[PDB]
C-alpha cells in the first residue's frame, strides 16, 4: 500500500522533470499546482 | 543544428495546442471574472508570449552551430533555414487568426473588446510577412 | 544475389534495420519536462542576477570590467540550467586498465554538481559498457605488452621533429607498409591523431570550385575539414539513397551557384558505422551512384575497421566489395587496436601526393615508437601471422555477443535503433529526467554506461549507448541483462509496441 | 450562448468586413509554394 | 524546362578533374631521410653516423633513464592507449595529476591538456573568437595560429613583425570606427595574438610595451610560448619570467610538451574563468581520444627533473650564445635570430633569383655536411597555402648534450663547405 504508493510519487517526479530540481524549487511547483486545482473546485461549485 | 528543426518534431503541434487549451482553463477558474474578459486575457497573453518567443529573442540557447552566424536573427527568421511557407510557418500564422474569431464571437462583438484584440492580432501578424524578414525598425533590438 | 535495387546495388546477404518511431503519448510528455526546466531556468537567471550570492562561478578580473564581456549570458543557457543539473555522470575518472572490468574513483558533491570532491574509496569491479574495446585488445598483460615495452626502452617516449625533417624513423616505414597489406591497397600513410587525419588532409584534396556531398550525421572532424577546405557543402538525408542521388543530378545540370560553370570535381563523405545512431552505410548503392556520376568517395571507418567482416577488414569486406573502388579509405587505431593514431590508404599516386602536400607531414610531430609497436604487434594477430589462433576467436566472439545481446533486449520490450549486426546498441529513453536517473541507477547496480542529451541529438531522442566487446563473457552479459531488466521496469522504459516473440 | 448569434446579426458592419478579409488571407496563404529567400 | 533528354545529355558530357594533380616537376622534397634507431645525440641518418643539430629536445630528456623508468611503470599498470574521449570513461587519474602539476609549475590557476601539439592552439582560438570579432596578429605567425584564425570566422588584421608603432597605428584606426557606430562597437571583442620566441624568425616579442596597449585599447592577449617554455627565464617558465611581467596580465598561454618535455601533447593555462569554457567548446578536446597514460607519466617526470634542478637553463643559454658568435663571417650566409634563442636560422645572402635555385643550393650544403659528422635540416613550408612565406633557410638547433668542442667543430665544418659552394 504505502510502499506501492511511493512508486507513484516516484513516477510523478520523472514525468514533470521535478526529479532534477532543488528541494526549494519543488515546494514552489507543488504549491502552485495545488492552488490551481483548489481554486478550480470553488469556481466549479459556485457555477453549478 | 537541431534548433531550426524543432517545429518538425513528432507531436509538437498537438503539444502546442494543448498548451493554449491549458492556459484557458487556469484562467476560467478565477472565482470572480466574467467570460468575455477571460477570453480577451487568453488571446492577449498568447499573443504576447508568441511575440516575445518568436520575434524578440535573438540567438540559440546553446553554442551556435556556425561561428555565431545566428546571433542576429530571431527564431522566426532562422526557422527552416529562412525558407518561407513551410508546413510549420503556415500553422503558426493560421493559429492566432483562428483564435481571434473565437474571442470576437464569445465577447458578443463588444465595441471595447475589438480595439484590444485587433491591435494584438496585428502585432503578431505584421512581423510574419516575407518583406519584414531581417528588417529592424529604427534600431529597436538591432544588436 | 539476394536482392537488387533500382540503382544497381547488389546485396549478397539480407540488410535489415529498425527505427521504430516514438509513441505519441510519450512524445507529448517530454515537452512538459523541457518547458518546466526552461521556466525554472528563467526564474533562476533573474534570481541570480542580483539576489542569490552565487559565490562560486569565477568572474572577470577587477581591472578588466571596462572591457567588452567575454562570453554571452544567453549563449550557454542550457549548460547551467539543464546539463549542469545532471552532469555528475560524465567525467567519471578511472584508475585501472579499461576493459570488461573497470575501477572508478568515487566522488560526491554538496552544492548540486557545482564543485565535486573525491572521497578516496574505489568502486572495484564495474562492468564496463562505455569504452570502445572491440576485440578486447585493451589490456596490461599479454604478448603486445612485451613488444611495446622493449621498443620503449631502446627509443624513448616520443620523437622531437617532423616527417619531412629529421623525424622520420624506420618504425613508421615498417608500419605504413603493413597497413597496406592489411587493407588490400597499394599504399598508406599514418598520422598520429584520428581527429587530425580528417581536418588536416581533406583541405589538401579539394578547394575553391569543388563540391562536397556530406552526410547528415557526420563526425565533427569531417565537418571541420570540409569547412577548412574552402568548398561548397550540401547535406543530404542520413543514409537516404534517394536524396543523395537527387543532389548528384542538380549539381551537374546546374553547375556553380552564381557563374553556372561546371564543378571541378565532386567528393562524397560518408562513414562505415554511425556511432550514435548505430547503423551501417549502404555501400553497394553509394558505389553504384559514384560510377554513374563520376564522383569520388571518401570512406571513414573508425568504428567498423576490426568490428565487422569475417576476418576484420571493415565494411568493404562485410559486403564483399572491391577495396579498389573506394578512392580514399580512412580509419583509426584507437577503437579496435587499443592504441592511438590514424591512417589513409589508396592508390600510390594519391599517397605520394599526400606525403608532400599534407599539413601533418610538414608541421606536426610523428607517432611515438611505443604506440607504433603495439599497432604492429596487434595487427599481426588479426592476420594470424603470429602462428596462433587469437585472431579468429575474438572476431567470432564479438559477432556472437552482438547477436545474442540485441535479441534479448528486443524480447524484453525496449526500443533499439539500428542494423542487426552493429556492435553499438543505443537504448531509447526520451524523458529528460530519465537521462539523470538511468546513469545513477546503473552505477548503483555496478554497471557503467553513457547517456546522450539534447545538444548532441534531437529534442525528443535521448538515448543510452551500449558499446559491446569481445572481452565480455556469457556470464557478464547475463548479469548485465538482469539489472537492465529491473531498472527498465523501475523507470518504465519499455515503449516497444510490437514486442518480439521468444 | 443564445444571445451570441443575436449579437452576431447585430454586429457592426465594419467588423465582418475585417473578418472576411482575414478569411480570404487564410485561403491566399494556404495555396502558396515555398520559394527560398535568395 | 530542361526535358529529360537534355538532362541526360548534360550528365554524359561532364568530366571531372583527377583527384590528385600529375607531378608537373620533380619536387624538392619526397625523399624522407630515414633515421635508424632513436634520434638521440649520436644518431644514424641514411646509414651514416653523425651528430644531429636538427631535433628539438633542448634539455635532452629523450634518453634519460629516469624518464623512461617513470613511463615503463605506468605502461605496465594502465596498458597503452585509452579507449574513450575524456568524457566517456576516457579520463584517468594521471591526467588530473598532470593538469594539477602544470598549473603549479606555471603559478597560474588552472590547466587543460590536449593529446596533440598542433590541435591545442587551432582549437583554442576559434573557441573564444567568433563571427563579428577583430583579431590583430603578428605577420610571422606559425601555421597552427593561421589555421586557428581561419577556423574562427573573424576579421583578421596583421601588422608588421615586432614594431609597436604599426600595431598602435592599426588600433587607432579601429578606435575611429567606434565613433561611427557606438552601438555596434559594444558587442565586438578584440584580441592580440602574439607568439613569444617566433620559430619562423628566431626573435623574441616585446611584452612590456605590449601590455600597456591592452589597458589603453581594451584588447586581450593570446600568448603562444611553445618554443620558449622550458628555455627562457631563470626557472624555465617562459618569457613572462624573462621580462618580469605579472602572469595575470596575459589572459591565456599555450604551449606543447613536444619540445622541452620530449613527449606528445599540448596544454593551455590561465585563470579558471577562461579555461573552464573550452572543456565543452574545444573541438579537438571533446571529439577525440585522450592522451595515453604512459606519455603523461613521462611529462610528469620531466617536470620533476626541471623543478629539481633549475641550473640547467643557464648552461643551455651559455652554450646557445656560444655558437651564435662563431657563425659570423660566413661568405654568403647570414645568421637570422636572437642571441638567446636556441633555434635560429641561416639565410642566404644575395639570393640567386627563383625560389627553387636557393632551395637546391642550400640542399647542397646539407648533403655535404652529412658526409662529415653534422646532421642538419632545412625549414619546410607549404608554399601554396601560407599567408607570408619565409625565405629558404637551414635550421640550427642547440641542446644541452653537445659539448663545446663539438660546437666548435660544427661551426668550423659548416664554414668550409659554405665557402666552397656559394663561391
Numbering used by the authors:
A (entry chain C): 9 to 56
B (entry chain D): 11 to 153
C (entry chain B): 45 to 546
D (entry chain E): 10 to 47
E (entry chain A): 51 to 473
Question: What's in the article?
Answer:
To investigate how ORMDL3 N-terminal mutations release SPT inhibition by ORMDL3 and disturb C6-ceramide-mediated SPT-ORMDL3 inhibition, we determined the structure of SPT-ORMDL3 variant bearing ORMDL3-ΔN2 mutation at an overall resolution of 3.1 Å for the monomeric complex. Although the overall structure of ORMDL3-ΔN2 mutant is closely identical to that of the WT complex, the N-terminal segment of ORMDL3-ΔN2 is disordered, rather than inserted into the substrate binding site as it is in the WT structure. This supports a vital role of Asn2 in stabilizing the ORMDL3 N-terminus. This is supported by the increased Khalf for palmitoyl-CoA in the ORMDL3-containing complex, whereas the flexible N-terminus of ORMDL3-ΔN2 would permit substrate binding, thus liberating SPT from ORMDL3 inhibition. In addition to the dissimilarities at the ORMDL3 N-terminus, the ceramide-like density sandwiched between ORMDL3 and SPTLC2 in the WT complex was largely diminished in the ORMDL3-ΔN2 mutant, suggesting that this mutation weakens ceramide binding. In line with this, the ORMDL3-ΔN2 mutation causes some local conformational changes for the residues near the ceramide binding pocket, especially Asn13 of ORMDL3, which would be expected to affect ceramide binding. Accordingly, the ceramide-enrichment from the purified ORMDL3-ΔN2 mutant was approximately 25% lower than that of the WT complex. Mutation of Asn2 of ORMDL3 to alanine achieved effects similar to that of the ORMDL3 N-terminal deletion mutants, supporting the importance of the polar interaction between ORMDL3 N-terminus and SPTLC1. The remaining 75% may largely represent ceramide, along with other membrane lipids, bound to the detergent micelles in the isolated complex, or, some other potential ceramide binding sites in the complex. These results suggest that there is an important interplay between the N-terminus of ORMDL3 and the ceramide binding site.
The ORM/ORMDL family proteins function as regulatory subunits of the serine palmitoyltransferase (SPT) complex, which is the initiating and rate-limiting enzyme in sphingolipid biosynthesis. In humans, the heterotrimeric SPT core enzymatic complex, composed of SPTLC1, SPTLC2 or SPTLC3, and SPTssa or SPTssb, catalyzes the first and rate-limiting step of de novo sphingolipid biosynthesis by condensation of serine and palmitoyl-CoA to generate 3-keto-dihydrosphingosine (3-KDS). In this work, we demonstrate that ceramide binds directly with and inhibits the human SPT-ORMDL complexes, a process that is important for establishing cellular sphingolipid homeostasis.
